[PDB]
């Protein structure tokens, strides 16, 4: 805290460059800027924020900011009208939640099909043609590709190609009631991916690392990653090339576009110095170059910097892909969506489940769940975090724990209160549904249905 700045940024981004622009700020304001790069920063921020700590400003793809805002963890930004002109308007929209601009857009990210130019003169024009390309390829001790399968971000570009989609853009907003992770398309993709993990084409444990080392070492002719990774493929030169993502079942592979944004903590002692830095030092050709030269940002939201940088081919490819797909939504429900698909891909791809069984759940874990009212909020005062005990008689439960559905309530309430999932209670859905099904057998008993 205090009168000096501290900021969080993901470990794969150029935080050394960010700290570099911080030494400049310091040198011109006498305010030491400290950059950090925690693990599960996206999940760790909303946790550390409530308990006094947390950075003065946090960096992350915009899709995660709707939630922070909802919880009142972020302070609305106040960029000049003139300063809003220096940034593309679409990057500003991806950062406006409920009419309030809640974060500064930095750069738009989009996964691309990276291919070893020395191995593959002509990259796979098709996704389903990878099996016949990894064929004549394995015939040398090399696979066709290796990307992080532990993160739904990298696998989703496929799953959505033939119709898979998160939250439909119904009316003027994202309809949390309309989810498409369990339709024919989503299954056509997930089927193929686990159809490539079965044909031995690629193990189902591959990491971001295990997948980066496998390309940085001429191990595999391809991989799927973003702008921030280009820096290591150049360091340990592998004569790579960045192009459009392979098409699946016809239509293009559509990646979920992300806009790296800087958010100002609501409880940031330095909320004006945050502005000075982000607005006058980072979001400038010099400032963005300092970060970029460390770990590519690829396609920045600064009109000036971008225009004369769309010249680069890899950047043009990144953008072409960003066009094939859709920009991620910022709503609070994204956190859960990502949970559902992360889990669904981890099971349907490890044999733990089948595509049908896995996505069926993904759809239920992404969709809205009932009960929330009679459990989350005031009712939680029954739970004593110290002992971890529940007072089923505390008037805060409204008596819910004692009646026709007393057992069902108890099961759902305790699960949410003992939950350590992300977001909390996302593992208690079925129990919240089971409880809801019980409210319906005694409708005269409940008004927890009045809606
Ligand atoms: O996993 C590395 C990847 O993380 C981010 O994508 C996240 C997204 O921001 C989260 O809100 C959630 O959806 O999980 C995604 C990964 O599955 C970054 O935006 C991306 O740049 C980074 O490479």
Swiss-Prot record:
GO terms for cellular component: ATP-binding cassette (ABC) transporter complex; ATP-binding cassette (ABC) transporter complex, substrate-binding subunit-containing; maltose transport complex; membrane; outer membrane-bounded periplasmic space; periplasmic space. The keyword Protein biosynthesis does not apply. Keywords: Periplasm, Signal, Sugar transport, Transport. It comes from the Bacteria. GO terms for biological process: carbohydrate transport; cell chemotaxis; detection of maltose stimulus; DNA damage response; maltodextrin transmembrane transport; maltose transport. GO terms for molecular function: carbohydrate transmembrane transporter activity; maltose binding. Gene3D superfamilies: Periplasmic binding protein-like II. Pfam families: SBP_bac_1. Induction: Induced by maltose and the transcriptional regulator MalT. Permanently repressed by cold shock in a PNPase-dependent fashion. It is found in: Periplasm. NCBIfam families: PRK09474.1. Part of the ABC transporter complex MalEFGK involved in maltose/maltodextrin import. Binds maltose and higher maltodextrins such as maltotriose. Belongs to the bacterial solute-binding protein 1 family. The complex is composed of two ATP-binding proteins (MalK), two transmembrane proteins (MalG and MalF) and a solute-binding protein (MalE). This is Maltose/maltodextrin-binding periplasmic protein. It comes from Escherichia coli (strain K12). The lineage of its organism: Bacteria, Pseudomonadati, Pseudomonadota, Gammaproteobacteria, Enterobacterales. The gene is malE.
């Amino acid at each position: 805290e205090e009168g000096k700045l501290v900021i969080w940024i993901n470990g794969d981004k150029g935080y050394n460059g960010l700290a570099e622009v911080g030494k400049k700020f310091e040198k011109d304001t006498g305010i030491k800027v400290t950059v950090e790069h925690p693990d599960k920063l996206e999940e760790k921020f909303p946790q550390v924020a409530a308990t006094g700590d947390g950075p003065d400003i946090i960096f992350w793809a915009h899709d995660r900011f709707g939630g922070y805002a909802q919880s009142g963890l972020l302070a609305e930004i106040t960029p000049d009208k003139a300063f809003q002109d220096k940034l593309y308007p679409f990057t500003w929209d991806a950062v406006r939640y409920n009419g309030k601009l809640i974060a500064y857009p930095i750069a738009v990210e989009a996964l691309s099909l990276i291919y070893n130019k020395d191995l593959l003169p002509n990259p796979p024009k098709t996704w389903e043609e990878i099996p016949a390309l990894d064929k004549e390829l394995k015939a040398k001790g090399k696979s066709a590709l290796m990307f992080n399968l532990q993160e739904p971000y990298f696998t989703w570009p496929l799953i959505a190609a033939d119709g898979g989609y998160a939250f439909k853009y119904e009316n003027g907003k994202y309809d949390i009631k309309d989810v498409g992770v369990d339709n024919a398309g989503a299954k056509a993709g997930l089927t193929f991916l686990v159809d490539l993990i079965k044909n031995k084409h690629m193990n189902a444990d591959t990491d971001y690392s295990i997948a980066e080392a496998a390309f940085n070492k001429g191990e595999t002719a391809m991989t799927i990653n973003g702008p921030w990774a280009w820096s290591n493929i150049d360091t340990s030169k592998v004569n790579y090339g960045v192009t459009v993502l392979p098409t699946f079942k016809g239509q293009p592979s559509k990646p979920f576009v992300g806009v790296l944004s800087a958010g100002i903590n609501a409880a940031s002692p330095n909320k004006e110095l945050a502005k000075e830095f982000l607005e006058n030092y980072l979001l400038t050709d010099e400032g963005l170059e300092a970060v970029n030269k460390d770990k590519p940002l690829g396609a920045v939201a600064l009109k000036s910097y971008e225009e004369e940088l769309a010249k680069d081919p890899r950047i043009a490819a990144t953008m072409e892909n960003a066009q094939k797909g859709e920009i991620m939504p910022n709503i609070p429900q994204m956190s859960a969506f990502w949970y559902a698909v992360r889990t669904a891909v981890i099971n349907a791809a490890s044999g733990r489940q089948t595509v049908d069984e896995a996505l069926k759940d993904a759809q239920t874990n992404s969709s809205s769940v009932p009960g929330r009212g009679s459990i989350e909020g005031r009712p939680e005062f029954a739970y004593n975090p110290d002992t971890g005990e529940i007072n089923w008689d505390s008037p805060s439960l409204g008596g819910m724990a004692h009646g026709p559905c007393g057992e069902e309530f108890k099961s759902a309430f305790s699960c949410f209160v003992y939950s350590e999932a992300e977001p909390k209670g996302i593992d208690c859905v079925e129990k919240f549904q089971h409880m809801q099904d019980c409210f319906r057998k005694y409708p005269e008993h409940y008004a927890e249905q009045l809606k």
